Subunit: 191 residues, 4 copies
């Protein structure tokens, strides 16, 4: 009976606490370090499932537009056939909020065995995480019950946007040129 | 500047009693005890006035100020920009700005009314392109687990073939942040001509909006340039999460049962 | 050194033998029977993985255009959340050329337990196939080795097109109207 | 009309010997024995002329005709339209017609030349919409397991962003059956202007074709009306399967190893 209902209040609070939490978790030298891993990589891959898969889909879109040669895969067979053709010049970002999705975990090791660098985003620390090149711990939702939780993508979209910012300032002139081409008059499939 | 040093500095200025109270506060473990100016006064068998005198001898206006600084020193640590990088501060302020923006835009009776439209609908459809496509896909994933019969479409061909099999019992939620994607906008009119309810999620108050059952104004990003803009999904996820919360509380017992069926032991394709 | 190379010959022969084989397998009263199951169903679903998934994708496209309310799903979680909201008025077509993909098999039973009618397309007869409402045996590829085989979709696209033909002639006037709407002048998203 | 009855009918017309040969052929198990007119003549200790006389007494022009009808009766069964339904005959004739059509259109040195373009390319892309999108997706799935670095795209936004990061080392295979989908056609020119090789798969000899490194004429369907047309994928799958066969035999040892890696015991995400 005030500016907002108890339900509108609960949602907006979960968002606020996701920003406060994410702030206390930032390891800027890691986030920047990863941003450079993308640049120095021949091919980048984003593995994810469910909502963690939608997070992988957007990242492919955003970085492709900055000139990155990348793909997003969201199913086990895609991971397995993609891993079989990886090398040391590959980088894999694995998205698993629970830190337990077997397909996501096994793929990063598969990528590790083929020589590729491996990054893991998850809200739950584990010990297999040592095996990966980096492990970015994201925020945990503030709703105890799964059903009442806000979008599962958010803990990860926070750190995607930060890595995006650190990456964009690396040789930004070239990236911003590749990005504006979408609107260019010569472009025959543009806006 | 340590409050432990300040009491030690003034220890030899204090009367025989105030020197005893200094001992209490100088022990590192009193920080755990209750210090509400009555539990502390009892514990030491003293008067409040006694404690107040103690405080002013250490350099404070009263007891209330002293304990305030005394306690809060346990969590003082760093209060500057630990996240120094102004680029990091740029993203985080885009996120906070968005949430603040979102708050001002909420029409709570509209959002609930959309939540109801979803329930009464037989088939719900989500239309979106690019990043707005991911938003539509997530809404399908989230509301299907509450039992909603829905589909998510992200190409023009899909919209047209989906609109051709709609009727007055369908509902179409279209997602176009700019408010100008022709396929999304022309697909809502398509659906409306078939009798379907239509909702539009966009940050731009456009005039075509009037041709839809609902039009939800989401927030604009805070970055002038597109290239620096944070994810295009969020203006919409804010409101998606709000409609989901309203919707979830409509016949919740039913929905929670369908949502938990994913983890059912009888479920042959679950966890 | 003739009209065609030994390699062009091998491919075109595998196609021919796929038509000859498919012909000897047709159970017309079954194919037509299934065509009616689609009509009498409130909601139709197509489950498939890999190339069997692409076969499910096309079928959704073709039948949706005849006015069928249908969806195609190609991953385990999609199957599981879709099955949880099925009823006796649902029909599920499951596509598994090997007849062994665990996700596909378990979903049809899941659909069976929720009351939905279940159809299975596979080139290998099994005994769990008894549990399904129908079981359409398709042709087997004529190349011994997996790698040298022609497209994995074909054994199934044969029978999709036959069921499509039997279905289209059921109340064909209504379906053909729903189909031409794509090109209609009033249609605001058309051709 | 049974050949067993015919010999029985004429049994009492045959000489003492021809009645013995009737016994051989009347046994149901001789059908398994060798009957090349020399193994049969040996086995019975007879001359060929003897057998020929036997045949003409049963009603045949020679021994060769008799055994021909005699043997082939084991698999005679039904030779009419078991698949009676003329609708079923409609689909099957669309399929056969397609394969026949495809044969006449094959430019074997073009198809092999495309197979080579794929090998030399660093990044391969498949563009297609609707049913032509499924064709592009399957090609990605099939050639990735031979080690090819490839991606499949099925929306306009995807084509534009993909073309902007192409160069002279890329190859784009565009799939438009009609030969007139603007997004597919304008995306090949996009790629070409970036230096990429371009291939077009379409059934319509168009003149834009001249602006591409290759243009593959696939078959037209046999059904005038679209609604009755069988799957739109096939005209292209025919040629896809042909390019795959040519491509697979380029450095096969390497490719087969990458293909079998899916079933590797060391593979941590395989079978
Ligand atoms: C508990 C639960 O409902 N999980 C679902 C999704 O919420 C999640 O996005 C997906 C990937 O999970 P992740 O790999 O841990 O991110 O798995 C499940 O489909
Ligand atoms: C301005 C711009 O770059 N647009 C691109 C995406 O960022 C966007 O998500 C999509 C949908 O646009 P929307 O419908 O306005 O959300 O169109 C384009 O792909
Ligand atoms: C042996 C093999 O390589 N199988 C692959 C695909 O060819 C197949 O399409 C898919 C679904 O298989 P299905 O369910 O048997 O059709 O499984 C695998 O990804
Ligand atoms: C005539 C027609 O109905 N076209 C539809 C589909 O059948 C087709 O697959 C797709 C690509 O068309 P293509 O590029 O000519 O193959 O466009 C439309 O979705
Ligand atoms: Cl905030
Ligand atoms: Cl044939
Ligand atoms: Na939450
Ligand atoms: Na922003
Ligand atoms: Na074959
Ligand atoms: Na045809």
């Amino acid at each position: 009976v005030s500016k907002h209902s108890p339900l509108t209040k609960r949602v907006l609070r979960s968002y606020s606490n996701m920003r406060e939490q994410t702030q206390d978790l930032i390891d800027e030298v890691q986030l920047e370090r990863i941003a450079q891993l993308i640049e120095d990589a021949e091919r980048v891959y984003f593995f994810g499932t469910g909502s963690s898969g939608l997070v992988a889909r957007e990242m492919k879109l955003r970085f492709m537009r900055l000139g990155v040669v990348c793909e997003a895969l969201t199913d086990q067979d895609g991971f397995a056939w993609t891993t079989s053709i990886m090398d040391e010049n590959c980088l894999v970002l694995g998205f698993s909020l629970s830190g337990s999705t077997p397909s996501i975990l096994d793929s990063l090791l598969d990528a590790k065995e083929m020589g590729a660098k491996t990054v893991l985003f998850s809200s739950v620390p584990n010990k297999d995480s040592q095996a990966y090149t980096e492990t970015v711990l994201v925020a945990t939702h503030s709703q105890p019950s799964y059903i009442q939780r806000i979008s599962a993508q958010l803990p990860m979209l926070f750190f995607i946007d930060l890595i995006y910012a650190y990456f964009l300032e690396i040789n930004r002139e070239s990236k911003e040129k590749i990005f504006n081409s979408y609107w260019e008059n010569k472009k025959l499939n543009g806006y």
